[PDB]
Amino acid sequence: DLLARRYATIGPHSPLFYRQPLELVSGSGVWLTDAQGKVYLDGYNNVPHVGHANPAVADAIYQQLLTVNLHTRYLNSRVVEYAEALLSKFDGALERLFLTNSGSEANELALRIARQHTGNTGVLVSDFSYHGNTTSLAEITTGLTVHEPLGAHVRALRIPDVSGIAEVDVPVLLEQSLADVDAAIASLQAAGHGVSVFLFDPLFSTEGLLQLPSGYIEGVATRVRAAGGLVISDEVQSGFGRTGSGMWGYQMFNVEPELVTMGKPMGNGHPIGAVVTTAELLDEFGRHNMFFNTFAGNPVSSAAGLAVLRYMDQEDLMAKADQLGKYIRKRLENIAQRSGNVGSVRGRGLFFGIDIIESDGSRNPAPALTKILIEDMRERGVLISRVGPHDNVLKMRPPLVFGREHADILLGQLELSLASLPQ
Amino acid sequence: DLLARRYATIGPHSPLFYRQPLELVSGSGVWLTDAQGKVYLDGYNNVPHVGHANPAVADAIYQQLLTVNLHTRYLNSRVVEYAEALLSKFDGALERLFLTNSGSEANELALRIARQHTGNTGVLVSDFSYHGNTTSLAEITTGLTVHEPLGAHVRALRIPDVSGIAEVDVPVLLEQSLADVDAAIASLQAAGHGVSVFLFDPLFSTEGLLQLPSGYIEGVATRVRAAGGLVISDEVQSGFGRTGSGMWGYQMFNVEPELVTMGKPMGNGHPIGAVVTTAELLDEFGRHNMFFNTFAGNPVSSAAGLAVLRYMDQEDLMAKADQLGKYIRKRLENIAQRSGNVGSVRGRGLFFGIDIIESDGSRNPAPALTKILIEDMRERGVLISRVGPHDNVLKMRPPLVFGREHADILLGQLELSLASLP
Numbered sequence: 001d002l003l004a005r006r007y008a009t010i011g012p013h014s015p016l017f018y019r020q021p022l023e024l025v026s027g028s029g030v031w032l033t034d035a036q037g038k039v040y041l042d043g044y045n046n047v048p049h050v051g052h053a054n055p056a057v058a059d060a061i062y063q064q065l066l067t068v069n070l071h072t073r074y075l076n077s078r079v080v081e082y083a084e085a086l087l088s089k090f091d092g093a094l095e096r097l098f099l100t101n102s103g104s105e106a107n108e109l110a111l112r113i114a115r116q117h118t119g120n121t122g123v124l125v126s127d128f129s130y131h132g133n134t135t136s137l138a139e140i141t142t143g144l145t146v147h148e149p150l151g152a153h154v155r156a157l158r159i160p161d162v163s164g165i166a167e168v169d170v171p172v173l174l175e176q177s178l179a180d181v182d183a184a185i186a187s188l189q190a191a192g193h194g195v196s197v198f199l200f201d202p203l204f205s206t207e208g209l210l211q212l213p214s215g216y217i218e219g220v221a222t223r224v225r226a227a228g229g230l231v232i233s234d235e236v237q238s239g240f241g242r243t244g245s246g247m248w249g250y251q252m253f254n255v256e257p258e259l260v261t262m263g264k265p266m267g268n269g270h271p272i273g274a275v276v277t278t279a280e281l282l283d284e285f286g287r288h289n290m291f292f293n294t295f296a297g298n299p300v301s302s303a304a305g306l307a308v309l310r311y312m313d314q315e316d317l318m319a320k321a322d323q324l325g326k327y328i329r330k331r332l333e334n335i336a337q338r339s340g341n342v343g344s345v346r347g348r349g350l351f352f353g354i355d356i357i358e359s360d361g362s363r364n365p366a367p368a369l370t371k372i373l374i375e376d377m378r379e380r381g382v383l384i385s386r387v388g389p390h391d392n393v394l395k396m397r398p399p400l401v402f403g404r405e406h407a408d409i410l411l412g413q414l415e416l417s418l419a420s421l422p423q
Numbered sequence: 424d425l426l427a428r429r430y431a432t433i434g435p436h437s438p439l440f441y442r443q444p445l446e447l448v449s450g451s452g453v454w455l456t457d458a459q460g461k462v463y464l465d466g467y468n469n470v471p472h473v474g475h476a477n478p479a480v481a482d483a484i485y486q487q488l489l490t491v492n493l494h495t496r497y498l499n500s501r502v503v504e505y506a507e508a509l510l511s512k513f514d515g516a517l518e519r520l521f522l523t524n525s526g527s528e529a530n531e532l533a534l535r536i537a538r539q540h541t542g543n544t545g546v547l548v549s550d551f552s553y554h555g556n557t558t559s560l561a562e563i564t565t566g567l568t569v570h571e572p573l574g575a576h577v578r579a580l581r582i583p584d585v586s587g588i589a590e591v592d593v594p595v596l597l598e599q600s601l602a603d604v605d606a607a608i609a610s611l612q613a614a615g616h617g618v619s620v621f622l623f624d625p626l627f628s629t630e631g632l633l634q635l636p637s638g639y640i641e642g643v644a645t646r647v648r649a650a651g652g653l654v655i656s657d658e659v660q661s662g663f664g665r666t667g668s669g670m671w672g673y674q675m676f677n678v679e680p681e682l683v684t685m686g687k688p689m690g691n692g693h694p695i696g697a698v699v700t701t702a703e704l705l706d707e708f709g710r711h712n713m714f715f716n717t718f719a720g721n722p723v724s725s726a727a728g729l730a731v732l733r734y735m736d737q738e739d740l741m742a743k744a745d746q747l748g749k750y751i752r753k754r755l756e757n758i759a760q761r762s763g764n765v766g767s768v769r770g771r772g773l774f775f776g777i778d779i780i781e782s783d784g785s786r787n788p789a790p791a792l793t794k795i796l797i798e799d800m801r802e803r804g805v806l807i808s809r810v811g812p813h814d815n816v817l818k819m820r821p822p823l824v825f826g827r828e829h830a831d832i833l834l835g836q837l838e839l840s841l842a843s844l845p
């Protein structure tokens with residue numbers, strides 16, 4: 001009676017995947033086993049960045065739990081070691097760290113640092129995005145339903161997507177998108193909000209995995225900084241080497257953010273987030289606020305984060321993701337060329353997707369067919385999902401220990417699944 | 424070079440206790456060891472509710488880490504088991520749960536549920552309180568420095584304290600305090616905010632461990648509910664049996680909150696928080712919001728929380744805290760009677776304090792002497808701290824495994840420490 005018992009305690013609205021919620025009882029690496037003993041390839045979960053049940057992570061956490069686990073008002077070496085290891089993954093002026101317990105807490109603090117620093121309130125976000133679940137983040141949310149109306153201090157941008165657009169038309173797309181940014185900024189200024197931040201997921205995953213014209217992000221940053229604002233890269237989806245080509249998603253662009261936020265993978269499942277920032281921004285915020293987060297930077301959270309970084313580094317996972325990503329993209333392009341139910345190939349590294357469309361010549365988004373594919377792939381023993389404003393972009397985002405053998409299983413099942421659709 | 428290295432990464436403002444920061448490298452139960460090998464009694468930390476390095480909590484976390492640790496979009500028994508165990512500690516209409524990763528995330532979500540439900544924004548809080556570190560909580564914060572001005576939607580209340588007041592004057596204190604509440608409410612209504620919530624820590628610990636006249640909390644609840652608002656009991660300090668006499672601090676008062684928040688001890692250090700509420704409030708919020716917290720309710724966090732409740736129940740810690748609390752209170756009263764540097768004895772269960780005052784007959788708060796006593800207690804091998812708007816209320820709040828042998832060591836050193844003052 002597990003579903004009933006859940007509904008009587010945490011309630012029926014807390015989301016569950018699939019028509020029939022799956023009960024997953026164990027995992028190992030990329031493999032998950034449900035309560036009936038069926039085994040699935042995990043094509044979806046990024047939180048277990050270094051695999052389900054990774055024993056190096058388990059051991060590091062357990063050993064620290066046998067030692068001591070206190071807040072950061074007493075000195076302790078584990079937090080300092082972890083901060084050093086994490087900050088060694090950043091360049092330029094990104095050289096200080098605030099630890100938190102979630103991605104929402106990180107984005108909440110980043111927006112607060114920015115609001116205080118800039119003396120402005122205005123927020124630029126995409127028109128189909130999600131950055132967390134606090135009050136301030138609800139007021140800026142466009143990609144999921146919330147009761148709060150969109151804040152008067154918010155402008156939502158239509159982030160440009162070159163996918164399937166003729167290469168001759170990109171310059172007009174870029175020029176128009178940037179004029180839209182100018183208009184947003186001028187609007188926020190006229191209203192008295194000014195510009196505090198541009199906040200974005202570098203993969204634009206919730207948006208449908210957009211491929212941007214070169215110069216868009218750089219152009220936004222320039223305009224935002226001319227308005228006295230800051231740039232925040234939300235790395236919850238693109239971070240920790242997920243893209244292959246760089247540790248952080250913002251590296252796909254010619255931009256250095258003042259603020260970088262993170263959560264998901266960082267502790268393999270342990271509740272940890274962070275805000276990485278400049279010396280000037282951390283120092284200022286600390287002079288103005290007696291800021292403290294009780295659980296942040298505790299030794300056990302730090303042990304978990306350290307073990308994740310150590311494991312990624314020892315197993316060369318980021319470089320592996322880059323090579324495997326390229327292979328997967330070539331296969332997906334073959335799939336797209338031949339399937340009338342596939343539009344464009346999207347993403348990078350081990351965050352990959354395809355938009356699912358009607359085969360009747362309309363190229364219309366086909367959410368229903370997308371659902372069919374998600375459910376059929378589950379039947380075939382692979383967990384995937386979807387994103388995007390039309391609910392038609394398959395989203396594949398496995399643990400970063402997913403290798404070539406796993407990719408061939410997933411892609412072969414995807415092909416067969418596509419071949420089973422009608423018309 | 425540990426201090427320097429910390430300052431180069433997480434910076435020099437992140438707070439540290441004591442003139443000379445202590446490096447604590449290990450602990451066991453109520454005992455901590457610093458990098459020089461000096462051993463201290465923990466009289467201060469409530470996060471390790473069931474003791475430093477508790478092996479049942481460590482084992483429950485590890486076994487689940489070796490099993491699976493996914494978000495709640497897949498069914499998993501651990502979260503359901505935990506939710507059942509936690510909700511079994513609540514009566515009346517408190518029968519649903521939202522899990523979070525901290526006490527701030529819980530209070531943030533509680534305010535949000537209340538704002539949406541009530542259609543109001545006004546907040547009543549104490550005038551020297553701290554409920555967390557988000558933007559919305561910064562705007563209501565009175566007991567610590569933040570850059571955000573106190574919100575136009577906030578009214579700060581002087582919570583009444585009967586400590587040292589003649590009994591004959593308590594009813595007048597109560598009456599005036601409640602008129603102050605009426606005035607706050609009418610101001611919020613005139614200004615168009617209305618009343619969304621009254622939010623409080625039942626021990627009023629940050630405020631200096633106030634002893635309230637009976638009927639104040641009941642009276643606030645009545646007035647807030649007549650204005651269409653809700654009551655939130657923040658249990659981060661008073662929860663999980665700390666008070667001895669009840670699982671939750673709000674049980675000290677004749678009040679059933681609509682919202683109860685928690686954090687700190689819940690997972691012995693593991694990052695967990697919660698909002699406990701009614702079926703109607705959870706249902707309404709879920710209909711109106713696609714609310715999801717990625718780490719909340721993961722199997723490992725639920726394993727941790729379960730191990731804490733199981734251990735507390737198995738070792739009878741709440742009932743022990745009630746009996747030991749009575750003994751400590753008697754000892755502290757003997758100490759207060761004898762020392763001209765001690766005013767009132769405060770708190771309940773294993774949250775206890777004393778105000779430290781000048782001995783010159785003025786009874787003026789003495790923050791400098793309080794700091795001397797904290798530093799001297801540290802030299803003698805006991806960790807304590809202080810709270811209150813005058814920074815003069817010693818705060819003792821040990822792991823809930825602290826027993827009588829520990830209380831005698833602490834209280835003996837405190838006596839000797841008080842005897843050393845001018």
Ligand SMILES: Cc1ncc(COP(=O)(O)O)c(/C=N/CCOP(=O)(O)O)c1O
Nearest residue numbers: 102103104130131132201236263716717
């Ligand atoms: C971009 C971005 N930024 C911030 C957050 C918030 O993190 P959280 O507080 O939930 O730890 C998410 C979450 N995303 C919740 C949905 O997770 P998924 O379906 O497995 O991708 C986020 O996607």
Ligand SMILES: Cc1ncc(COP(=O)(O)O)c(/C=N/CCOP(=O)(O)O)c1O
Nearest residue numbers: 293294525526527553554555624659686
């Ligand atoms: C009443 C109350 N409500 C919420 C919070 C916030 O919890 P968090 O987000 O830091 O886990 C605190 C914390 N308080 C941080 C100070 O910790 P202490 O000195 O060891 O008592 C709180 O005191």
Ligand code: NA
Nearest residue numbers: 215218253254
């Ligand atoms: Na760019």
Ligand code: NA
Nearest residue numbers: 336339340342
């Ligand atoms: Na195609």
Ligand code: NA
Nearest residue numbers: 638641676677
């Ligand atoms: Na009362």
